Design a protein around this motif. Structure first.
Motif, PDB file in Angstrom:
ATOM      1  N   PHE A 200       0.871  -1.070   0.106  1.00 33.21           N
ATOM      2  CA  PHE A 200      -0.127   0.107   0.002  1.00 33.21           C
ATOM      3  C   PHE A 200       0.746   1.219   0.092  1.00 33.21           C
ATOM      4  CE2 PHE A 200      -3.363  -2.437   2.531  1.00 33.21           C
ATOM      5  CZ  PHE A 200      -3.788  -2.991   1.275  1.00 33.21           C
ATOM      6  N   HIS A 201       0.102   2.246   0.094  1.00 35.88           N
ATOM      7  CA  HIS A 201       0.872   3.857   0.156  1.00 35.88           C
ATOM      8  C   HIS A 201       0.558   4.353   1.410  1.00 35.88           C
ATOM      9  CE1 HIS A 201       1.181   3.969  -4.613  1.00 35.88           C
ATOM     10  NE2 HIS A 201       1.986   2.917  -4.042  1.00 35.88           N
ATOM     11  N   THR A 202      -0.316   4.013   2.157  1.00 36.65           N
ATOM     12  CA  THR A 202      -0.789   4.531   3.293  1.00 36.65           C
ATOM     13  C   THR A 202      -0.239   3.692   4.491  1.00 36.65           C
ATOM     14  OG1 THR A 202      -2.839   3.688   3.754  1.00 36.65           O
ATOM     15  CG2 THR A 202      -2.633   5.710   2.245  1.00 36.65           C
ATOM     16  N   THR A 203       0.410   4.247   5.360  1.00 38.04           N
ATOM     17  CA  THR A 203       0.809   3.351   6.715  1.00 38.04           C
ATOM     18  C   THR A 203      -0.355   3.313   7.527  1.00 38.04           C
ATOM     19  OG1 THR A 203       3.091   3.722   6.176  1.00 38.04           O
ATOM     20  CG2 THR A 203       2.644   2.790   8.473  1.00 38.04           C
ATOM     21  N   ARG A 204      -1.241   2.433   7.317  1.00 40.06           N
ATOM     22  CA  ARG A 204      -2.330   2.228   8.476  1.00 40.06           C
ATOM     23  C   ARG A 204      -2.256   0.760   8.638  1.00 40.06           C
ATOM     24  NH1 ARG A 204      -7.484   3.459   5.251  1.00 40.06           N
ATOM     25  NH2 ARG A 204      -6.166   2.730   3.536  1.00 40.06           N
ATOM     26  N   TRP A 205      -3.137   0.275   9.286  1.00 37.75           N
ATOM     27  CA  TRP A 205      -3.321  -1.147   9.381  1.00 37.75           C
ATOM     28  C   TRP A 205      -4.101  -1.701   8.568  1.00 37.75           C
ATOM     29  CZ3 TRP A 205      -0.222  -4.402  11.309  1.00 37.75           C
ATOM     30  CH2 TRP A 205      -0.764  -5.860  11.577  1.00 37.75           C
ATOM     31  N   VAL A 206      -3.526  -2.629   7.699  1.00 38.81           N
ATOM     32  CA  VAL A 206      -4.186  -3.421   6.730  1.00 38.81           C
ATOM     33  C   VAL A 206      -4.320  -4.794   7.582  1.00 38.81           C
ATOM     34  CG1 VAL A 206      -1.753  -4.306   6.120  1.00 38.81           C
ATOM     35  CG2 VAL A 206      -3.706  -4.931   4.910  1.00 38.81           C
TER      36      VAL A 206
ATOM     37  N   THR B 156     -25.920   1.748  -3.012  1.00 40.48           N
ATOM     38  CA  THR B 156     -25.047   2.083  -4.040  1.00 40.48           C
ATOM     39  C   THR B 156     -23.666   1.562  -3.684  1.00 40.48           C
ATOM     40  OG1 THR B 156     -26.434   3.975  -4.442  1.00 40.48           O
ATOM     41  CG2 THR B 156     -24.406   3.672  -5.507  1.00 40.48           C
ATOM     42  N   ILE B 157     -23.127   2.271  -2.485  1.00 38.06           N
ATOM     43  CA  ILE B 157     -21.545   2.048  -1.908  1.00 38.06           C
ATOM     44  C   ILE B 157     -21.804   1.579  -0.805  1.00 38.06           C
ATOM     45  CG2 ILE B 157     -19.470   3.304  -2.454  1.00 38.06           C
ATOM     46  CD1 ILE B 157     -21.087   5.728  -3.674  1.00 38.06           C
ATOM     47  N   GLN B 158     -20.417   1.454  -0.368  1.00 36.56           N
ATOM     48  CA  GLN B 158     -20.356   1.023   1.276  1.00 36.56           C
ATOM     49  C   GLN B 158     -20.515   2.349   2.078  1.00 36.56           C
ATOM     50  OE1 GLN B 158     -16.564  -1.008   1.658  1.00 36.56           O
ATOM     51  NE2 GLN B 158     -17.156  -2.177   0.082  1.00 36.56           N
ATOM     52  N   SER B 159     -20.042   2.426   3.315  1.00 31.55           N
ATOM     53  CA  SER B 159     -20.101   3.677   4.345  1.00 31.55           C
ATOM     54  C   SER B 159     -21.445   4.191   4.242  1.00 31.55           C
ATOM     55  CB  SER B 159     -19.098   4.698   3.588  1.00 31.55           C
ATOM     56  OG  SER B 159     -17.807   4.014   3.372  1.00 31.55           O
ATOM     57  N   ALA B 160     -22.377   3.336   4.558  1.00 32.10           N
ATOM     58  CA  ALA B 160     -23.777   3.728   4.766  1.00 32.10           C
ATOM     59  C   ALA B 160     -24.515   2.839   5.514  1.00 32.10           C
ATOM     60  CB  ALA B 160     -24.833   3.448   3.382  1.00 32.10           C
TER      61      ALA B 160
ATOM     62  N   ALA C 181     -12.334   1.572   4.589  1.00 33.00           N
ATOM     63  CA  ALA C 181     -11.596   2.899   4.661  1.00 33.00           C
ATOM     64  C   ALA C 181     -11.113   3.341   3.308  1.00 33.00           C
ATOM     65  CB  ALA C 181     -10.718   2.651   5.807  1.00 33.00           C
ATOM     66  N   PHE C 182     -10.645   2.154   2.486  1.00 37.60           N
ATOM     67  CA  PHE C 182     -10.118   2.691   1.146  1.00 37.60           C
ATOM     68  C   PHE C 182     -11.188   3.635   0.409  1.00 37.60           C
ATOM     69  CE2 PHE C 182      -6.193   0.654   0.842  1.00 37.60           C
ATOM     70  CZ  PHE C 182      -6.230  -0.307   2.068  1.00 37.60           C
ATOM     71  N   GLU C 183     -12.459   3.138   0.289  1.00 39.08           N
ATOM     72  CA  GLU C 183     -13.686   3.650  -0.449  1.00 39.08           C
ATOM     73  C   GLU C 183     -13.753   5.147   0.138  1.00 39.08           C
ATOM     74  OE1 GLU C 183     -17.151   1.751  -0.630  1.00 39.08           O
ATOM     75  OE2 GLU C 183     -16.632  -0.113  -1.730  1.00 39.08           O
ATOM     76  N   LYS C 184     -13.769   5.190   1.488  1.00 40.77           N
ATOM     77  CA  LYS C 184     -14.090   6.478   2.048  1.00 40.77           C
ATOM     78  C   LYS C 184     -13.168   7.401   1.896  1.00 40.77           C
ATOM     79  CE  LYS C 184     -15.404   8.502   6.479  1.00 40.77           C
ATOM     80  NZ  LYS C 184     -14.419   9.601   6.549  1.00 40.77           N
ATOM     81  N   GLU C 185     -11.819   7.133   1.904  1.00 36.83           N
ATOM     82  CA  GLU C 185     -10.570   7.937   1.515  1.00 36.83           C
ATOM     83  C   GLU C 185     -10.663   8.171  -0.060  1.00 36.83           C
ATOM     84  OE1 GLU C 185      -8.215   9.323   3.091  1.00 36.83           O
ATOM     85  OE2 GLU C 185      -9.517   8.785   4.881  1.00 36.83           O
TER      86      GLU C 185
END
Ligand code: 3PE
Lengths: 171, 74, 71, 347, 168, 99, 98, 140, 296, 90
Positions: C38-44, F18-22, F34-38
């Motif tokens: 990844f590119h963001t150091t979070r917790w995968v 439609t998407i997640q985060s709902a 969290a990837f989708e939200k970002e």
């Protein structure tokens, strides 16, 4: 891409509750009331920062709390508590309605010798406040900042300039 | 008349009519909603404490907050 | 309590398997040694191949597919 | 049939198109196309000849395989970047199969063989509803997925559709295959503009639908299938002649007449790019498809054929249908040259 | 007797689709499609897998091939082309299995990591309510529009079927 | 074209599918929440083309969440090098259960 | 990608070829359309399950009920053809020529 | 395809000869595959051996057009020594049209093919030389 | 040991079927007026063992279809006592009632394949009508099953055998249960609701019958489950299943076969509104009695 | 693998019994069609209905009540349409 960093093996030796699961369900509620004042600190760390390798010391603290709790229940009443959890142990998926009389016996034990009111329904709920030393962290979603807005529309609109400005059909 | 020719049709319309009309008026639907709401599947979160708010009871035996009690109380 | 034990166990398997990724490729060219993709150091959360690798059958079958055709 | 049943079925065709126009979720688009198919089948086979049975069979097979290929495109889209937002796709393969799904849907030259077959073997009302609505609704889909199209798709399918719909039509004497070949010709004109300025395409859609409604009302003036029947429409009525003249030349698109507004503005905001060889080739083939319009005109409204007695017997009686909306669509389809600044009515 | 049972069942699935894509007599076709649907249900019930394939097992293999066999029996009732296409489809299956096994990656127009894959998979996370079953236990709280248009298209399918089969 | 009756009548009767985060029905996330939200908060009020200029990083990050193809690539490279070294003769295997 | 997804798409495209090229009967063609329905079903289902995208789990069951009523319409049409002729061949469709 | 037309337009024209002829035969093989595929798809040849004959005829004609056109392209560019005129390809298109007519064994088809193939090949080189964009902008 | 569980599951059902043949012949005789079989063997048990032996001895399509019909019928007969909670079911399926429906549909496949391979037009149209009246009642069976488990929450059926400790579920839906029992009569293809190897075909039929009897007994009633002693529950469950099977005989031996159009007319225009109205009442009503069952 | 083994044992014992059973010697009606499609459509509406008891614990009880009654009412209305339009005569 950037490489990860973890705590090594010499950070992850904390003595764990090496008891089974049936007894761990059998002594659930009074564990939920006697201890578990500081585990919500662990839970708050875990939800506010979804990064284990940051919150594990509160895991050590709840580990030693639960170990102290089982020490306290072992070296005192009840010994037929052992008969209680082995009575709920063989009843398939565990129900609290089957082996009930021994639960009342264990409760009479703990109320006479030690105390520990069994909590009501639904008292193992009811969203809870707690405060620590640590602050709320900035950008727990680790990212950049959001890039730009739009150059937006501000001002009234004039009448149209000399018409359609197509081939003809002026004005 | 209306009954002898198609009796099971009349009985079906009758029990269907009460199964439509009767969910309007009842003294129990609020109890159904409260029982269905107050059974916690997920985990009720702990939060950073307050802006000094007169709610959110600290101890799980502290009787400030919202409580389900009428299961024992019928 | 179980969540704390699960954190310690998954961190244990991650430390084991990154130590053995450092060992098992000791001389290969190219190859940075600890590349998070990844590119963001979070917790995968890893994908149950890095939690469970090189096990040869027993724990991987009885710890991933065991529940589904169990019960 | 009951008139209750037909008002229900027409309401469902409308409902399918409104669901396709209205939604932001890909499953709703697929259900809209399917429901449109399901209801549009029993508008065909209003009679019970084997012509309609075979025509609805061919239409069903091509339309259903187009719908399942569209669902394949959606499922590729969510094998990749996974969300149900009707927007830019994230695979050239998904966009490829989606454009080929629409090219099977509304008729393009690799995929167009079913259109004259299905339009001949049905009555005119079913042909009217299929051409107008089935070519209205997927243009909305293209307008929603325009930013992620390989242009070679729309270019190839559009050019090939113009030239195939041109060259077919020199031989057909049946009215309905003429009208379907005209349909593929306007599908080429309505599709090639799409990746440049889609307001042109949607205005071309409104133009084509108004023109084709005028044409099918004039062929419902009396039930005619060949051109010879239209020569007898000359002998029985004089004003149907001059309206076939004006609307046929407006399908041809001459500059004093309102069928030139699709060509003209599209060439303009086509060559404010620097595609020039493609517009001039398209306009040459647009000169080509005007010939069968012109030979129909020469057959009926300009020369006069020999005719038949019992038209003497037909002179007494009125042509007493109700024309559904004839005069408004006639003079709104033909005299609408000096309102090309009603292009920008759209957005 | 080994790990890659998902890939194995998927090989039987491709075998079934080839076995009726060679255009047999249509009741041989129905047999092959029943076998295909059964192993597809096995595959989805192996990816956990609680409900949804078994749900459709009633419908796709309980309410469709019955009607196909019905309308085949009351409509109508060996050759080198069918057997030849079956053998060549089996050969393409054999070649794709070989390129999965003794290579690293396989590309049709993608990249497929060539090894049997339990990955990706859940990390034993606490569901306690069987996620896909509660997903299907939607449509009835949030699903306003969807079941409305679905039941409406069912009703229109009813009147369409009877009209085409000679209303009234 | 496309109309906005979904917007004007206000009841977002389809923007929940439609998407997640709902509102997932009992409040759980998916695997790649969290990837989708970002990525959505990257390209929210952006005109869809400078989004393609300046949200490429998080979108590749999201696709690597969903597919995990590069992680499988590294994993397969590790396993095939493991196979060639255990065939060639370094450490008849201790790397499990006996460290 | 994965390993299973390649085999399901290979099964899909072989089902698509069986749908497109078809020799004598139309029942086998509609049956191959049913097989293509199965392929899209299984593909979307395994996608949604592996994502743990619990929210829009409507897709597979509603996909299949709709493509089921598509097949119902198709069987009605095929039985209409076989009524108005002797068989259900691709021949007897040779009239209404281009 | 893009690859072989790019191979054809890679070589300067110019004298780097007979690669041009081989690339033009690849053009012929592709064109023959297209025409033969649609023709056997829309005929029912009855039987397959005659279909092989039809496909071989179309591919051989298209490959022969490519070969003769590449040869006369290279030869005319070497003789006239001016690698910028379109008139050499005008001569080339007429030569290809005449050989198409001779393999179809006629006169009028050959002469009209000479005229139209010559003018279109002139347009091809003329647009590649002055610069006319391939198939799109797609910008505005 | 699990293989011993398998063998004790799927082998004694065949002895169960054979002794069911002797029981139904004996009790239908004592209904009618007949002792017998009582001559070959003491009280007629060697007589059915010899029945199966003699039918195996005898010396009687498209061997594909000719073998794939009875192999599928009997593997359904074997597989279809998997989740029935004789207290500990063999596989704890989290959903099994939908599996019941699916395997009824597979039995429909078996009858259609044997009818196709019969290859004679009178047997073909007979098997066609039998497929239609087999499939015409899986609607009603499904919807009644839906309404009776909506009172009990989950598909698991072990929660069902929990919930029938308080009352027998025959009371809070009696007409719904009665209509389900008539649909079991329809699905079993017996009176009133109506070539080889007939041993296999016959065998699969009767195993499906005893499956529906046991599933009736579990779905609707039962006994109180003793902790750590399931033998008493198994005894009272088995005796209830046997009394219902004798009741099934008792309904067999007294009514003529329906006319087929009367059967269809009866199903649609007599079950189908009444099942729907009872099912919507069981939808709308547990939300009105403050009582929705806990899916766990 | 439990139920896979049981399924395989059922198949093998059934094949053993078939091989013992084998080796020891060694125009139409339109009314038929409407039954099948009527079953198919009502079985699809069954397929919509039957996950209702999984759903029966929501916080929006009124919406679930209304759409559930919508589904069964449409099923009965389709039955009523073919009932009035003599859809299953004989
Ligand atoms: C050929 C295969 C035939 C399969 C028949 C259908 C089997 C079935 O219905 O299995 C359902 C069951 C679902 O599991 P269940 O016990 O309901 O608990 C949920 C989480 N395991 O499934 C299971 O318990 C296991 C799923 C199938 C595993 C074996 C697949 C073999 C192919």
């Amino acid at each position: 891409p950037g490489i990860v960093e973890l705590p090594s093996l010499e950070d992850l030796k904390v003595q764990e509750v090496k008891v089974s699961s049936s007894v761990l369900k059998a002594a659930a509620h009074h564990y939920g009331a006697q201890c578990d004042k500081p585990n919500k600190e662990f839970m708050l760390c875990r939800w506010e920062e979804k990064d284990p390798r940051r919150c594990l010391e509160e895991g050590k603290l709840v580990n030693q709390c639960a170990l102290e709790f089982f020490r306290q229940i072992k070296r005192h009443c009840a010994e037929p508590f052992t008969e209680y959890w082995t009575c709920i142990d063989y009843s398939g998926l565990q129900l609290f309605r089957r082996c009930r009389k021994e639960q009342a016996q264990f409760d009479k034990c703990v109320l006479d010798k030690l105390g520990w009111v069994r909590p009501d329904l639904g008292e193992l709920s009811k969203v809870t406040k707690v405060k620590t030393d640590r602050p709320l962290p900035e950008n727990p979603y680790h990212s950049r900042a959001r890039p730009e807005p739009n150059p937006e529309v501000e001002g009234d609109l004039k009448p149209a300039r000399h018409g359609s400005r197509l081939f003809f059909w002026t004005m | 008349n209306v009954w002898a020719k198609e009796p099971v049709l009349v009985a079906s319309f009758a029990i269907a009519g009460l199964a439509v009309i009767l969910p309007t008026l009842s003294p129990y639907t609020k109890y159904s909603l409260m029982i269905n709401r107050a059974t916690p599947y997920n985990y009720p979160v702990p939060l950073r404490d307050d802006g000094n708010m007169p709610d959110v009871p600290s101890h799980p035996q502290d009787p400030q907050g919202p409580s389900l009690e009428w299961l024992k109380r019928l | 309590l179980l969540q704390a034990e699960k954190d310690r166990r998954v961190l244990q398997m991650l430390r084991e398997n990154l130590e053995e990724e450092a060992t098992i490729m000791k001389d290969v060219p190219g190859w940075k040694v600890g590349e998070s993709v990844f590119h963001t150091t979070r917790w995968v959360t890893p994908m149950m191949g890095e939690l469970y690798g090189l096990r040869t059958g027993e724990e991987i079958l009885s710890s991933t597919y065991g529940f589904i055709w169990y019960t | 049939m009951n008139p209750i049943i037909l008002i229900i079925i027409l309401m469902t065709v409308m409902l399918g198109t409104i669901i396709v126009m209205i939604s932001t979720h890909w499953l709703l688009i697929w259900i809209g196309f399917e429901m449109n198919m399901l209801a549009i089948i029993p508008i065909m086979m209003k009679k019970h000849n084997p012509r309609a049975t075979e025509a609805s069979t061919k239409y069903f097979l091509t339309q259903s395989t187009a719908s399942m290929l569209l669902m394949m495109a959606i499922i590729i889209n969510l094998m990749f970047s996974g969300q149900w937002t009707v927007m830019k796709l994230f695979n050239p393969m998904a966009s490829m199969l989606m454009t080929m799904a629409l090219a099977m849907k509304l008729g393009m030259a690799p995929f167009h063989f079913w259109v004259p077959e299905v339009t001949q073997g049905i009555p005119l009302s079913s042909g009217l509803i299929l051409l107008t609505w089935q070519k209205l609704a997927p243009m909305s889909v293209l307008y929603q997925i325009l930013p992620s199209i390989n242009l070679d798709l729309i270019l190839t399918l559009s050019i090939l559709s113009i030239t195939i719909g041109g060259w077919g039509g020199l031989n057909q004497t049946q009215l309905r295959k003429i009208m379907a070949y005209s349909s593929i010709a306007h599908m080429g004109w309505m599709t090639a503009v799409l990746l440049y300025n889609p307001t042109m395409t949607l205005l071309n859609l409104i133009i084509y639908i108004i023109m084709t409604s005028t044409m099918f009302t004039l062929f419902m003036a009396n039930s005619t299938t060949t051109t010879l029947s239209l020569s007898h429409t000359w002998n029985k009525a004089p004003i149907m002649t001059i309206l076939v003249l004006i609307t046929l030349l407006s399908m041809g698109g001459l500059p004093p007449l309102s069928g030139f507004m699709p060509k003209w503005m599209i060439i303009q905001e086509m060559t404010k790019n620097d595609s020039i060889i493609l517009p001039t080739l398209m306009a040459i083939t647009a000169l080509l498809n005007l010939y069968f319009y012109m030979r129909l005109t020469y057959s009926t409204a300009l020369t006069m054929f020999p005719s038949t007695n019992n038209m003497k017997m037909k002179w007494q009686f009125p042509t007493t249908k109700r024309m559904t909306l004839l005069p408004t669509m006639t003079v709104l389809s033909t005299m609408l040259l000096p309102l090309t600044p009603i292009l920008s009515i759209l957005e | 007797m080994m790990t890659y049972i998902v890939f194995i069942l998927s090989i039987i699935f491709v075998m079934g689709f080839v076995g009726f894509s060679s255009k047999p007599s249509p009741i041989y076709g129905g047999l092959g499609l029943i076998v295909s649907g059964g192993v597809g249900c096995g595959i989805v019930l192996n990816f956990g897998g609680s409900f949804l394939g078994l749900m459709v097992f009633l419908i796709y293999l309980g309410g469709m091939m019955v009607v196909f066999g019905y309308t085949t029996a009351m409509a109508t009732e060996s050759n080198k082309v069918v057997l030849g296409t079956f053998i060549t489809g089996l050969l393409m299956e054999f070649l794709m299995v070989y390129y999965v096994l003794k290579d690293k990656e396989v590309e049709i127009v993608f990249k497929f990591n060539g090894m049997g894959d339990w990955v990706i998979y859940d990390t034993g996370d606490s569901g306690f309510f069987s996620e896909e079953a509660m997903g299907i236990a939607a449509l009835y709280s949030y699903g306003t529009w969807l079941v409305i248009v679905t039941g409406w298209s069912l009703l229109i399918g009813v009147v369409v079927i009877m009209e085409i089969t000679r209303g009234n | 074209p496309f109309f906005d009756v979904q917007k004007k009548l206000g009841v977002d009767l389809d923007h929940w599918m439609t998407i997640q985060s709902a509102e997932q029905p009992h409040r759980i996330p998916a695997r790649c929440h969290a990837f989708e939200k970002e990525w959505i908060e990257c390209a929210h009020g952006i005109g869809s083309i400078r989004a393609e200029k300046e949200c490429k990083i998080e979108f590749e990050d999201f696709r690597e969440c969903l597919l995990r193809q590069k992680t499988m690539k590294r994993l397969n490279a590790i396993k095939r090098q493991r196979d060639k070294l255990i065939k060639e003769g370094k450490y008849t295997p201790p790397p499990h259960h006996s460290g | 990608m994965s390993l299973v997804y390649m085999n399901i798409m290979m099964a899909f495209t072989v089902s698509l070829t069986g749908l497109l090229m078809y020799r004598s009967h139309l029942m086998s063609s509609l049956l191959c359309l049913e097989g293509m329905m199965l392929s899209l079903f299984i593909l979307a289902t395994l996608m949604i399950l592996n994502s743990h995208f619990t929210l829009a789990s409507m897709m597979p069951i509603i996909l299949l009920v709709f493509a089921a009523c598509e097949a119902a319409l198709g069987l009605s049409l095929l039985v209409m053809v076989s009524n108005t002729y002797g068989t259900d061949y691709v021949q007897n469709l040779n009239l209404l020529q281009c | 395809a893009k690859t072989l037309l790019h191979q054809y337009w890679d070589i300067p024209e110019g004298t780097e000869c007979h690669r041009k002829t081989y690339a033009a035969t690849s053009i012929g093989g592709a064109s023959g595959l297209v025409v033969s595929a649609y023709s056997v798809a829309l005929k029912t040849p009855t039987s397959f051996l005659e279909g092989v004959a039809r496909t071989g005829r179309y591919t051989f004609t298209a490959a022969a057009i490519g070969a003769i056109f590449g040869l006369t392209s290279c030869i005319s560019a070497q003789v006239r020594e001016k690698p910028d005129d379109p008139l050499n390809y005008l001569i080339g298109g007429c030569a290809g049209g005449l050989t198409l007519g001779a393999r179809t064994r006629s006169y009028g088809i050959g002469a009209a093919a000479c005229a139209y193939m010559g003018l279109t090949a002139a347009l091809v080189k003329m647009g590649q030389l002055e610069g006319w964009k391939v198939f799109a902008e797609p910008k505005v | 040991m699990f293989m011993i569980n398998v063998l004790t599951l799927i082998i004694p059902i065949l002895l169960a079927v054979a002794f069911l043949t002797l029981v139904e012949r004996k009790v239908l005789g004592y209904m009618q007026f007949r002792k017998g079989p009582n001559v070959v063997g003491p009280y007629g048990l060697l007589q059915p063992i010899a029945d199966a032996i003699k039918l195996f001895i005898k010396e009687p399509s498209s061997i594909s279809m000719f073998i794939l019909a009875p192999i599928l019928a009997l593997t359904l007969a074997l597989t279809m006592w998997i989740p029935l909670p004789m207290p500990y079911p063999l596989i704890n399926m989290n959903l099994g009632v939908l599996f019941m429906l699916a395997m009824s549909s597979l039995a429909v496949y078996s009858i259609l394949w044997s009818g196709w391979a019969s290859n004679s037009k009178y047997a073909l149209i007979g098997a066609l009508r039998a497929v239609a009246q087999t499939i015409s009642y899986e609607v009603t069976l499904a919807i009644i099953l839906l309404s009776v488990l909506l009172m009990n929450g989950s598909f698991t059926l072990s929660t069902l055998i929990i919930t029938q400790e308080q009352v027998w579920l025959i009371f809070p839906a009696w007409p719904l249960a009665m209509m389900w029992f008539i649909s079991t009569l329809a699905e079993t293809n017996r009176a009133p609701f109506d070539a080889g190897p007939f041993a296999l075909f016959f065998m699969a039929e009767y195993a499906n019958i005893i499956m529906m009897n046991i599933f009736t007994t579990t779905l609707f009633l039962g006994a109180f489950h003793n902790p750590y002693m399931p033998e008493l529950y198994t005894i009272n469950f088995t005796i209830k299943s046997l009394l219902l099977s004798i009741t099934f005989l008792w309904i067999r031996a007294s009514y003529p076969r329906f006319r087929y159009d009367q059967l269809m007319h009866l199903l649609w225009k007599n079950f189908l509104p009444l099942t729907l109205a009872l099912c919507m009442w069981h939808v709308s009503l547990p939300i009105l009695l403050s009582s929705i069952p806990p899916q766990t | 693998m439990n139920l896979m083994i049981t399924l395989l044992t059922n198949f093998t014992l059934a094949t053993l019994l078939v091989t013992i059973a084998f080796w020891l010697p060694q125009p139409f009606s339109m009314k038929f069609f409407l039954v099948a499609i009527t079953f198919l459509l009502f079985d699809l509406e069954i397929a919509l209905l039957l996950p209702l008891p999984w759903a029966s614990q929501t916080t929006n009880l009124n919406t679930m009540l209304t759409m559930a009654l919508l589904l069964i009412f449409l099923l009965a209305v389709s039955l009523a349409y073919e009932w009035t339009q003599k859809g299953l005569e004989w």
